Design a protein around this ligand. Sequence first.
Ligand SMILES: O=P(O)(O)O[C@H]1[C@@H](OP(=O)(O)O)[C@@H](OP(=O)(O)O)[C@@H](OP(=O)(O)O)[C@@H](OP(=O)(O)O)[C@H]1OP(=O)(O)O
Length: 145
Amino acid sequence: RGFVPQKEIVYNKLLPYAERLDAESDLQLAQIKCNLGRAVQLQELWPGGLFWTRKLSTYIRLYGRKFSKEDHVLFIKLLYELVSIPKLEISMMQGFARLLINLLKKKELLSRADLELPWRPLYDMVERILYSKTEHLGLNWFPNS
Ligand SMILES: O=P(O)(O)O[C@H]1[C@@H](OP(=O)(O)O)[C@@H](OP(=O)(O)O)[C@@H](OP(=O)(O)O)[C@@H](OP(=O)(O)O)[C@H]1OP(=O)(O)O
């Protein structure tokens, strides 16, 4: 087809209506790429960005990674920038983090040459949450997990 799929779920192929599944996967991914990109550029993180981030997590659950290496790296880069925003709501970061962990969970797919994420932004986040001066005074109110 248009792209070479990465890590698609095998059970989808065995399903009785499998032939129809390929068309749905292409359309849903196409909408996710356009809408997630549009939301971040338009700066609408809560109404649209979160909704489309959730749709991609559902896409991975339903269809497996099922995307090109270029798409996989682009999603991972976008999520890392969203996860490392300095003043981001910690609840909002938790949703972004779960999608980013799922994308990077299988390290066979990416070859190190494909992805070169930085470490200093992640360090700023761990200092902010793991060792927060404000939380002891009750100013921060961080999430449980
Ligand atoms: O074959 P399933 O029962 O659907 O389980 C698989 C399998 O897990 P196990 O084979 O270990 O049960 C994968 O693991 P491997 O192919 O690496 O052996 C993988 O799990 P990993 O990510 O730990 O590899 C994946 O999990 P996910 O859904 O997170 O992709 C998935 O488990 P699910 O039942 O959750 O699909």
